[PDB]
Design a protein around this ligand. Structure first.
Ligand code: Y01
Ligand code: Y01
Ligand code: PLM
Ligand code: PLM
Ligand code: PLM
Ligand code: PLM
Ligand code: PLM
Ligand code: PLM
Ligand code: PLM
Ligand code: PLM
Ligand code: NAG
Ligand code: NAG
Ligand code: NAG
Lengths: 55, 365, 339, 233, 128, 112, 37
């Protein structure tokens, strides 16, 4: 089990040394994406009966 | 109208009476005898002194009931004290008619009301099975043909009770439309009773005969339910044409009716023996679970009462009408209620109260 | 004791990561997306119903042309559907009737499937004789196959119940990279749009981000309380969503290294079986054990709709690449297209 | 002409659904079974009586085809791949009755409890094979192994009146093997609204009657399934 | 981050008493069924006791009935095991195990060799 | 007297049935004069308050059946059931086909 | 006479056509007094 404990400790140092941006910056990027691609989403916008291939 | 037809049968019987009175001249011993005579409505043979003769009531008048009997008495024949003339007791013929006619109106309106709720509840039950594909199975495919017989049978009965029965001008005219409507009535009535057998055969093989039944070709179910009732109805129609060609084929006195009701009762008796094996397996499944005495007999009653409308067991347990007046009255109210509401009961039990239907309909609504 | 010393040093490393994540948690996603417009009620109708399968549908996958889709069912059949005309293009009989995953190649020439047989079988659709035959079988895994996804015609990534993911060369049929680190059955995987990375969620209430080229675990994402059943990437590839048995969906950001949003309701007490995003990522569609799929406002965490046309457990669901329709399979043996 | 491509689609779909109904007849005719059991229980001996991630065994009793599946090369975490067997006819749960001295019998009582109360296996009946009855008899006949140690409620247990002892067997073996069965039947009757049932059998690994026990129990499961469709039971 | 930390343990004389505590974190303690499992030297994982979500249904393995008492404090998110009349056969590493899914009657894979929702355990040694 | 009443309408019945002698036995032909004789008898008896049937009325009705009707009989009246030997043959024959059709459904309904 | 249960609806239809004057009024009953035969 010591061998498995050492591999977990070695993985935690690889994940502790990671550059993390703030959640306010990470949330503003997801919010800005759905805004730029809102028109291209047929499930959001109304679907015309003429352009819908499932009518 | 009916008076002259009654008098014509009255004078026809007089010819046949004096023909028989011209023959049969034997009056041998038996002490003194009340001599043979022709009563104004019936012909009486040679009888001994003291024996109260008995004969069925003539059908000359609408009041008279053929079921009842006429009694004539000898000492010389009986003399009514009022006018000291030879008398025959025709009182039993028309005494129970005015009260039996009043009971017949409520039985008539119990049918058109009972059969109307059947067509209504079954056209809804049939639409649920054809619309919801989720409910689709070999059991439902047999229910759909069984539901169709109830609709088509209850439809013709109403057309028969609303157009043919209250029309006396049509029956005395005797058109061919009466006989072909009576043909489809006898055919759809037989198809209705023979699909109760098809439902009992499928239910019996699923539970008793062949549990490991993948799925069956329904081509033989269709021939028994739809195809076979053509044989007794075609045989009956041909013999009814050459032997008893009654006006509009409304008579029930002929024994040619048992050409259709013979095989019909035979099919329903087999359904009664299928019910005995199903409730035998059911109570055996519960004894293996070690249920209580109460719950075991409670569910055996519940399961039996939901199979009675489907298999038509009411025709087997009550197959004969009592001759008593008070008992025959209750029998008429009980059996007519079960017959005319049988389509309503089947639609409620197997469509509206079915849990797989209630769960599916609520989910899609 | 060298074992406990390694256990306490892992505890301090976990506290260092937990505090480094809290230092970046300056504001909540609900505080950023507070003043945006709600999407409104999402009323979607069943346009098609595919009635070919005999048993419960365990997986499905759309083609990149957004018209053809493959469906895996546990009666031992892979049916290729023409979603427009409801016609069946192919029907592949499988050797193992316990298929639990199916994939559609981006080129459209191959399909893959696997299950309790521990094998990923590649089926060549564009055969010269015209009928589909099995071209390759990958037999390295020691547990049941939970998910498989094509990188290209020659590469495929599979997750398995042996707590391991693997990358395969298809023409050689050999594992080129193995991804270890999970302590539970890996239940699903989701490829990034660039396909340089993929994320996998296992039964240890954890999700891991893997690098395909180097075969290492980049980040580990915790926060769920029970097994993660489904996972799906955000359209931009900077976030993903997980569905777990604790009846909760959560949204994790890669660069923030922590969860951003939680999608839960007190009435919902059944686990999530499938997750998928729309073309824009504004809607989060999740299949549940209560037989209906719920549409979530991925930014507002408010339920926006319900897809309640299935009569059994919704096992799979997928959105087309063009975003036109959603296909949800379920244990009721039917596959419905919603629009 | 694009109508040609759609006519070629209808004829290709027509050939497929012709084959899909031939496979529907084969699928409904076969009865799938999950053979579940721990190690050291005699489970593998039963399949020889009739690597890969699952083993399939095809047998036929009275012209009815059965397809039994034995899970191999899988980890001991079953909570995920056990859901694939919610539509099987029955789960054949094999238990070693002799393994009560570890305490493998308690480990099997908790596994049966998890299977019985799993939400996806609540309509799946379980065929319980209390295997290794021949080894249990030798263990009980000796005074070395006392079931009172691992199950202290065995000190006040009495053999039920409905218990049918085998011809010429010790009552101490009858009381022991029926006590183990009641431990499983207490879990089986605690929950369940008639949706699924448990069929316990005293089993030996070399017993030939094992396929007939599964056949007769599966015939009961299908029979109760038909009775429930008609709301009779 | 689901974490289960067990405290207590230590060397006890035969017939002594011990009380094990299990501090739970990272989940709703009241929605899950809790278990006690142990691993004797040179043996596998053995299930000991369980307690339901509320604390009404309590089950023990036969060996510990009458001597062990399981308790949960849903307010403080703690699980207890009052151990009385300790025998030398009780020497084992006692793990605090959590049920895999909430609101479920089934509890799967708790005694597995590699189970995620289980603590690291406390060493209890009964000797003189 | 009542003899003058019966002697009158007997002559009326004679004159009605004297020319058509070949039709004496066909009941469809002589039904109208026969019902005419009955009317006169019960009407004149009720007129004199003698009552019907009376011995004087039954005396001349036997004169018509003794003279006018000679060796003539009807084979069978219409609306009559067949001889009961063939009646049961027509009822049992469809019943015998029922068991054979039942075995077709139980044993020969297996697909393929 | 058909006295089975399956002949119940035909027995009722036959009775109404035979006895009832098209389900309308009530004619006086036949005279079965001392004067009557
Ligand atoms: C109302 C009177 C004047 C006429 C009544 C005629 C029916 C009794 C006949 C005419 C057409 C016959 C049907 C013609 C064809 C079929 C299909 C046959 O089944 C199949 O061939 C379908 C495939 C299969 O299930 O194997 C079953 C008998 C049935 C319904 C026959 C049943 C008897 C029917 C309905
Ligand atoms: C209206 C009067 C003159 C009576 C006419 C009777 C027959 C000419 C008709 C009426 C009802 C018909 C039946 C109604 C329904 C069916 C079932 C049908 O099969 C199914 O419903 C199959 C469903 C499925 O499994 O998908 C085949 C034809 C059949 C027997 C029909 C055959 C022709 C019948 C007997
Ligand atoms: C549940 C069903 C009940 C049916 C009750 C039916 C009652 C019918 C009452 C009819 C009364 C008499 C109607 C006029 C009869 C007539 O003169 O022809
Ligand atoms: C498809 C067949 C339908 C048959 C419907 C019933 C037909 C009845 C026919 C009655 C004919 C009456 C006259 C017969 C000849 C005669 O006696 O003069
Ligand atoms: C195998 C089951 C056979 C059932 C046979 C049932 C026959 C019923 C017959 C009814 C009509 C004959 C009896 C009444 C006769 C009469 O009233 O004159
Ligand atoms: C409308 C009234 C219907 C009455 C139906 C009565 C049906 C009685 C059935 C009794 C079945 C008895 C079978 C044998 C005994 C047993 O179940 O073990
Ligand atoms: C097994 C089911 C049997 C059903 C029997 C139904 C008829 C019962 C009564 C039969 C009476 C037979 C004698 C009738 C005499 C008569 O009225 O002319
Ligand atoms: C196989 C069927 C068995 C049961 C048969 C039950 C028959 C019941 C009816 C028999 C005739 C009853 C006549 C009663 C007459 C009266 O009460 O006045
Ligand atoms: C399920 C259908 C049930 C039908 C029940 C019908 C009962 C008819 C028999 C009872 C009639 C009672 C008449 C009482 C008359 C009075 O008050 O004197
Ligand atoms: C669904 C079952 C309905 C049963 C109905 C039973 C009705 C019994 C009473 C019928 C007669 C009611 C009084 C009628 C009086 C009248 O003739 O004017
Ligand atoms: C009937 O018989 C009696 C003798 O028993 C006889 O006196 C009488 O005349 C007979 N009836 C007729 C009409 O002749
Ligand atoms: C008339 O009837 C009465 C009734 O008792 C009877 O006394 C009398 O004798 C009868 N008269 C004749 C003439 O028969
Ligand atoms: C006629 O019959 C009824 C009933 O059978 C009886 O009450 C009555 O007294 C009879 N009449 C005569 C004159 O005997």
């Amino acid at each position: 089990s010591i061998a498995q404990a050492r591999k977990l400790v070695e993985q935690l140092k690889m994940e502790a040394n990671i550059d993390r941006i703030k959640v306010s910056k990470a949330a503003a990027d997801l919010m800005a994406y759905c805004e730029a691609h809102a028109k291209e989403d047929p499930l959001l916008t109304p679907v015309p009966a003429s352009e819908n291939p499932f009518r | 109208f009916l008076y002259v037809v009654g008098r014509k049968k009255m004078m026809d019987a007089q010819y046949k009476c004096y023909d028989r009175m011209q023959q049969l001249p034997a009056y041998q011993g038996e002490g003194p005898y009340c001599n043979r005579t022709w009563d104004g409505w019936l012909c009486w043979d040679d009888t001994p002194a003291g024996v109260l003769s008995y004969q069925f009531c003539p059908d000359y008048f609408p009041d008279f009931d053929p079921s009842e009997k006429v009694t004539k008495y000898c000492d010389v024949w009986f003399k009514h004290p009022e006018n000291n003339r030879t008398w025959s007791n025709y009182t039993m013929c028309n005494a129970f008619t005015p009260e039996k006619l009043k009971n017949a109106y409520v039985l008539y309106y119990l049918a058109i009301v009972g059969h109307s709720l059947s067509i209504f509840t079954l056209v809804i039950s049939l639409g649920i099975f054809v619309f919801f594909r989720s409910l689709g199975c070999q059991r439902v495919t047999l229910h759909k043909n069984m539901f169709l017989t109830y609709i088509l049978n209850s439809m013709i009965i109403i057309i028969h009770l609303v157009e043919v029965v209250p029309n006396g001008e049509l029956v005395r005219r005797d058109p061919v439309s009466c006989k072909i409507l009576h043909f489809f009535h006898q055919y759809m009535m037989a198809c209705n009773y023979f699909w109760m057998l098809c439902e009992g055969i499928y239910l019996h093989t699923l539970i008793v005969v062949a549990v490991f039944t993948e799925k069956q070709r329904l081509r033989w179910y269709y021939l028994l339910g739809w195809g076979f009732p053509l044989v007794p109805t075609t045989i009956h129609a041909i013999t009814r044409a050459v032997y008893f060609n009654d006006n509009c084929w409304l008579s029930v006195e002929t024994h040619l009716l048992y050409i259709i009701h013979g095989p019909v009762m035979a099919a329903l008796v087999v359904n009664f023996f299928f019910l005995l094996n199903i409730v035998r397996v059911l109570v055996t499944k519960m004894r293996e679970t070690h249920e209580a005495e109460s719950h075991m007999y409670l569910k055996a009653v519940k399961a039996t009462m939901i199979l009675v409308p489907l298999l038509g067991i009411q025709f087997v347990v009550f197959p004969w009408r009592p001759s008593n007046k008070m008992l025959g009255k209750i029998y008429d109210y009980v059996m007519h209620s079960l017959i005319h509401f049988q389509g309503f009961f089947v639609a409620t039990i197997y469509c509206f109260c079915n849990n797989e239907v209630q769960t599916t309909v609520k989910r899609q609504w | 004791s060298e074992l406990d010393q390694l256990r306490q040093e892992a505890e301090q490393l976990k506290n260092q990561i937990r505090d480094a994540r809290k230092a970046c948690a300056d504001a909540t996603l609900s505080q950023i997306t507070n003043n945006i417009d709600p999407v409104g009620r999402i009323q979607m109708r069943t346009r098609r119903t595919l009635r070919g399968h005999l048993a419960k549908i365990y997986a499905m996958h759309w083609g990149t042309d957004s018209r053809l889709l493959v469906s895996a069912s546990q009666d031992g059949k892979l049916i290729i559907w023409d979603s427009y005309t409801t016609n069946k293009v192919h029907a592949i009989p499988l050797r193992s009737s316990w298929v639990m995953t199916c994939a559609y190649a981006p080129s459209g020439n191959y399909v893959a499937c696997g299950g309790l047989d521990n094998i990923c079988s590649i089926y060549n659709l564009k055969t010269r004789e015209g009928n589909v035959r099995v071209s390759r079988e990958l037999a390295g895994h020691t547990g049941y196959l939970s998910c498989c996804r094509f990188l290209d015609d020659n590469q495929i990534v599979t997750s398995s119940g042996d707590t391991t993911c693997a990358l395969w060369d298809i023409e050689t049929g050999q594992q080129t990279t193995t991804f270890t680190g999970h302590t539970g059955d890996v239940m699903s995987l989701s490829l990034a749009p660039d396909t340089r990375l993929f994320v996998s969620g296992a039964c240890d209430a954890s999700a891991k981000l893997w690098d395909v080229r180097e075969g290492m675990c980049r980040q580990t994402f915790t926060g769920h309380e029970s097994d993660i059943n489904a996972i799906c990437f955000f359209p931009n590839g900077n976030a993903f969503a997980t569905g777990s048995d604790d009846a909760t969906c959560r949204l994790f950001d890669l660069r923030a290294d922590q969860e951003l949003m939680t999608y839960s309701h007190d009435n919902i007490i059944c686990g999530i079986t499938s997750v998928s995003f729309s073309k824009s990522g504004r809607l989060l569609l999740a299949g549940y054990d209560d037989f209906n799929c719920n549409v979530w406002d991925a930014l507002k965490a408010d339920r926006a709709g319900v897809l309640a046309g299935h009569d059994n457990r919704v096992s799979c669901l997928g959105v087309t690449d063009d975003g036109m329709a959603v296909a949800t399979g379920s244990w009721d043996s039917f596959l419905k297209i919603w629009n | 002409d694009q109508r040609n491509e759609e006519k070629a689609q209808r004829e290709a779909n027509k050939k497929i659904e012709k084959q899909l109904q031939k496979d529907k007849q084969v699928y409904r005719a076969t009865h799938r079974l999950l053979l579940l059991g721990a190690g050291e229980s005699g489970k593998n001996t039963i399949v020889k009586q009739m690597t890969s991630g699952i083993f399939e065994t095809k047998f036929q009793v009275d012209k009815v085809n059965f397809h039994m599946f034995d899970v191999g090369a899988q980890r001991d975490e079953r909570r995920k791949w056990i859901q694939c067997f919610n539509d099987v006819t029955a789960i054949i749960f094999v238990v070693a009755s002799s393994s009560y001295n570890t305490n493998r019998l308690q480990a099997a009582l908790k596994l049966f409890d998890s299977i019985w109360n799993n939400k996806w296996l609540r309509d799946t009946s379980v065929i319980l094979f209390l295997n290794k009855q021949d080894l249990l008899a030798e263990k009980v006949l000796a005074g070395k192994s006392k079931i009172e140690d691992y199950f202290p409620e065995f000190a006040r247990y009495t053999t039920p009146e409905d218990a049918t002892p085998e011809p010429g067997e010790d009552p101490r073996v009858t009381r022991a093997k029926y006590f183990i069965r009641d431990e499983f039947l207490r879990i089986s009757t605690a929950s369940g609204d008639g949706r699924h049932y448990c069929y316990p059998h005293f089993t030996c690994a070399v017993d030939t009657e094992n396929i007939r026990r599964v056949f007769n129990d599966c015939r009961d499961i299908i029979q109760r399934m038909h009775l429930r469709q008609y709301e009779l039971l | 981050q689901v974490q289960l930390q067990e405290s207590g343990g230590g060397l006890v004389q035969p017939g002594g008493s011990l009380r094990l505590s299990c501090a739970a974190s990272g989940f709703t303690f009241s929605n899950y069924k809790m278990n006690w499992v142990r691993q004797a030297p040179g043996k596998g994982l053995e299930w000991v006791s369980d307690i339901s979500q509320s604390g009404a249904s309590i089950s023990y393995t036969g060996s510990v009935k009458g001597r062990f008492t399981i308790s949960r404090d849903n307010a403080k998110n703690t699980l207890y095991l009052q151990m009385n009349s300790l025998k030398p056969e009780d020497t084992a590493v006692y793990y605090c195990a959590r049920c895999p899914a909430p609101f479920t009657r089934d509890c799967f894979d708790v005694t597995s060799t590699t189970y995620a929702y289980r603590g690291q355990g406390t060493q209890v040694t009964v000797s003189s | 007297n009542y003899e003058t009443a019966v002697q009158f309408c007997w002559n009326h019945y004679k004159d009605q049935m004297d020319p058509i002698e070949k039709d004496w036995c066909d009941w469809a032909m002589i039904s109208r004069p026969y019902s005419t004789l009955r009317d006169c008898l019960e009407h004149f008896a009720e007129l004199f308050d003698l009552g019907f049937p009376n011995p004087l009325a039954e005396r001349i009705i036997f004169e018509t059946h003794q003279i006018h009707f000679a060796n003539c009989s009807l084979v069978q009246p219409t609306f009559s059931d067949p001889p009961e030997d063939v009646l049961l043959a027509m009822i049992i024959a469809p019943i015998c086909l029922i068991p054979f059709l039942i075995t077709l459904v139980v044993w020969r309904s297996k697909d393929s | 006479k058909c006295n089975t249960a399956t002949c119940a609806t035909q027995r009722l239809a036959n009775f109404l056509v035979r006895s009832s004057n098209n389900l309308g009024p009530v004619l006086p009953p036949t005279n079965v007094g001392s004067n009557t035969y």
